[PDB]
Amino acid sequence: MATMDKVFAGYAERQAVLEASKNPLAKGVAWIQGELVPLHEARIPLLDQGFMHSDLTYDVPSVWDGRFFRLEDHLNRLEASCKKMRLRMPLPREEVIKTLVDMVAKSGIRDAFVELIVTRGLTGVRGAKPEELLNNNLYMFIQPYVWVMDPDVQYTGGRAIVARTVRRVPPGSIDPTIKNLQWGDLVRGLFEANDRGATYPFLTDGDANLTEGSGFNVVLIKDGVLYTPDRGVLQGITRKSVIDAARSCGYEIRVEHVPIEATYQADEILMCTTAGGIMPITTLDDKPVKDGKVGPITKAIWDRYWAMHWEDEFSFKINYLE
Amino acid sequence: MATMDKVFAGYAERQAVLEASKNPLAKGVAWIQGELVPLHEARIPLLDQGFMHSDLTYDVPSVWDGRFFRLEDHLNRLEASCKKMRLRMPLPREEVIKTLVDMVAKSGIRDAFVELIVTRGLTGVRGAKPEELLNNNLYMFIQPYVWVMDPDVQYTGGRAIVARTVRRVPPGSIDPTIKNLQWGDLVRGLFEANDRGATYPFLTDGDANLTEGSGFNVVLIKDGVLYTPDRGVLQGITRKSVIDAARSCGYEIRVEHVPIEATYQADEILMCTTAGGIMPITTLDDKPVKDGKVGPITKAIWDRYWAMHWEDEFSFKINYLE
Ligand SMILES: *Cc1c(COP(=O)(O)O)cnc(C)c1O
Ligand SMILES: *Cc1c(COP(=O)(O)O)cnc(C)c1O
């Protein structure tokens, strides 16, 4: 399984079973202070600082065909984000994983979006001593796999703009390697994209370089070489997988500063994210990207990315039997 | 009532009554989808985009001695913030005010922190059509008045640092005139201040100008003239009241770019915010601000700001009798 047709046929088959389910957890499940609740019924304390000041980090691993994909990479990134924020995982890792796998199994969901959120808790940083800020809260949930680009659009590629009315929050305000939900710039980018008849905004760093978009990294392909911005962006696990895939497929990939001009000169463009995978861009600022077709290197990356989902090195099988 | 002793003595007497109250709502009350809930019991949906992507705006008016202070100014600012964010107030203004005054009356709180939050609702911007993003959510709560600087400390002033490890989110990322809860830079500032043995961080715009701090505006006084940053900051209602007070007292106040160097040259420094009022700063970067005492112009502004709380132009009396 890794041509688009094969990957999507498997998804379609599993999705048909899931859409027919009468399981009250089939639309997702949340873990709230040690209790499982259907996702759409889940509630959190008003006073949680994750809401009061978006004072949190989070991470989103995924399950594909009943297999957790790169879960340890996501959990290590979450731990790193927590350390940077002076937060601590409220449960030890074996309990986190045990709980996630139980949630997935109970839901019956085979292709899942999985989110963990660690918040400061009920006491705000403002006016507190460090010792008063150690009771951090954890929220976790799973839901049916989410597509930032629908399967059918991945065949043709999507429409992007380089945002001109907004730029990325600079690392000296918020470190973008700490995964966070402070989406003020990204939401402005989304509205700009919609106003300009596109779906995906690419944000600059306000100094004429490409950064990332609204929840995805961006990779440019130029003369058989892949390029992706180093600074100013989340170091995506999908991006990590694209770096692995490039080397697997025998291409070079450069993680470095990418002048915005390079977007206009690119042979192929793709976006990457856990919620959707490898997402080609074939129109930029209302003009085709080269010939306006999904490029061959993109297709090689696409196939290898998905093939990784069935390899032990990158995934593990969840037991759904209860 | 306008000298510190008199204003704080009134608060202390009301507080003693409030602390002795057995009414569970004396600790605060929230409005959640048309229902009043004790504040610490209040819960919001996990899927609310106000939590999921901090996709919201808010505003914080106040009640002092049973009088709402400049409520219309806060509601107009909240309406202006909503318009900029493509949000709409979920209730008409007469219902908002009626609900807030009912909540205050039920709680018995005479000196109150009041918060209104308007979120995108349960549907995220990413992947939506404009018409799918109109079901916005409202949350409101009141709690006992919050002090960003305690009354006793206001006599002698607090310790600030100019932040060096973080700068303010630029307006080209997030417009700081839209009041918001995306505090990543402000929380970084709070941690830096605590690491450096201070309480209040002043953030620069990353281009050697003063902006604001973690939930307060900053006003410098130099040779009898007041100065406060124009760009890069929330246009505070307390700041508005300081502008009013300055003119009332016969001082000039300039709202303009304030090079960071001016902070070090200032005769007096104050912070201003709804949650605590007029808060003198007497130590900056471990050095006294001039003689290290609360200055005379600060004290004039202080008294006038508080006197405005009993004037009909700026306040209205809540009826607590049921
Ligand atoms: C999560 C995220 C991405 C993609 O990261 P993955 O680990 O590939 O899912 C890209 N940009 C931003 C801003 C993000 O928060
Ligand atoms: C609310 C706020 C202030 C102070 O505004 P007031 O209207 O005086 O309460 C200052 N800075 C920031 C960043 C704020 O959100």
Residue numbers in the entry:
A (entry chain B), B (entry chain A): 1 to 322
Reproduce, without paraphrasing, sentences from the article in which this PDB structure was first reported.
In this paper we describe the substrate specificity for an (R)-specific ωTAm from Nectria haematococca and its three-dimensional structures in both the PLP and gabaculine-bound forms. The Nectria TAm belongs to the fold-type IV class of PLP-dependent enzymes and is built up of two domains of α/β type. Thus the relative positioning of the small restrictive pocket and the large pocket gives the enzyme its (R)-enantioselectivity towards ω-amines.
The native (internal aldimine form) Nectria TAm structure and its complex with the inhibitor mCPP (gabaculine-PLP adduct) were solved and refined to resolutions of 1.68 and 1.50 Å respectively. The asymmetric unit of the holoenzyme contains the catalytic dimeric molecule of the Nectria Tam. The PLP cofactor in the holoenzyme structure is bound at the bottom of the active site pocket with the re side of the pyridine ring exposed to solvent and the si side resting on the side chain of Leu234. The PLP phosphate group is anchored by a salt bridge to the side chain of Arg77 and H-bonds with the main chain nitrogen atoms of Ile237 and Thr238 and the side chain oxygens of Thr238 and Thr274.
